[PDB]
Amino acid sequence: GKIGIFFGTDSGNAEAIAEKISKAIGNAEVVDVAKASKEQFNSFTKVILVAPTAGAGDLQTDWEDFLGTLEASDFANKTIGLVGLGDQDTYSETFAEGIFHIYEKAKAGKVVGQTSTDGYHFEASKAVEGGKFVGLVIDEDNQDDLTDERISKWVEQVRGSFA
Numbered sequence: 423g424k425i426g427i428f429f430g431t432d433s434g435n436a437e438a439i440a441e442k443i444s445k446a447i448g449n450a451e452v453v454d455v456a457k458a459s460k461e462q463f464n465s466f467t468k469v470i471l472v473a474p475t476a477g478a479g480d481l482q483t484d485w486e487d488f489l490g491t492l493e494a495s496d497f498a499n500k501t502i503g504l505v506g507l508g509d510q511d512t513y514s515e516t517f518a519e520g521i522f523h524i525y526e527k528a529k530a531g532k533v534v535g536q537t538s539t540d541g542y543h544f545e546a547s548k549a550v551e552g553g554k555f556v557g558l559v560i561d562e563d564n565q566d567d568l569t570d571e572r573i574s575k576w577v578e579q580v581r582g583s584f585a
């Protein structure tokens with residue numbers, strides 16, 4: 423696979439999502455960030471990073487350890503895609519933020535997949551940037567039934583960049 427899709431998960435939401443996103447975009451290899459290295463991250467030019475949100479809008483532990491091993495340097499030569507899971511209902515003030523961290527570094531490459539906030543309902547989020555989401559935002563908790571179409575639509579918007 424040309425496209426690498428790295429995810430960390432605690433309940434398999436992200437993993438199911440990354441699988442789906444691979445089903446749809448195609449030509450991809452799905453990797454748990456928990457069992458990988460920058461060495462494997464840099465085996466790819468075109469990447470899609472799926473990541474759930476933890477305490478204080480932080481990253482799921484595994485994604486947290488992983489990103490720790492990467493620096494802006496590592497995201498420079500890459501086309502990056504951001505796809506953060508989250509709960510808009512139980513965490514108003516911090517919704518699908520985890521991705522904003524990965525974002526802090528990945529803004530050093532070409533990040534595509536910015537999406538609208540329409541139909542999402544939250545008080546705050548570091549994931550909103552320049553007026554819209556830094557990438558795709560999944561909410562399996564409250565909006566599970568919207569996952570497939572958001573994926574189908576996002577892969578559409580993406581196709582171009584990840585080709």
Ligand SMILES: Cc1cc2nc3c(=O)[nH]c(=O)nc-3n(C[C@H](O)[C@H](O)[C@H](O)COP(=O)(O)O)c2cc1C
Pocket residue numbers: 430431432433434435436437474475476477478479480482507508509510513516517518519562563
């Ligand atoms: C410790 C904990 C903290 C969480 N914090 C947030 C949060 O800050 N913002 C948010 O939108 N979702 C938050 N969530 C929801 C998860 O990101 C969501 O349930 C996710 O889909 C789980 O991913 P997984 O099943 O791949 O592990 C939190 C979940 C847990 C367990």
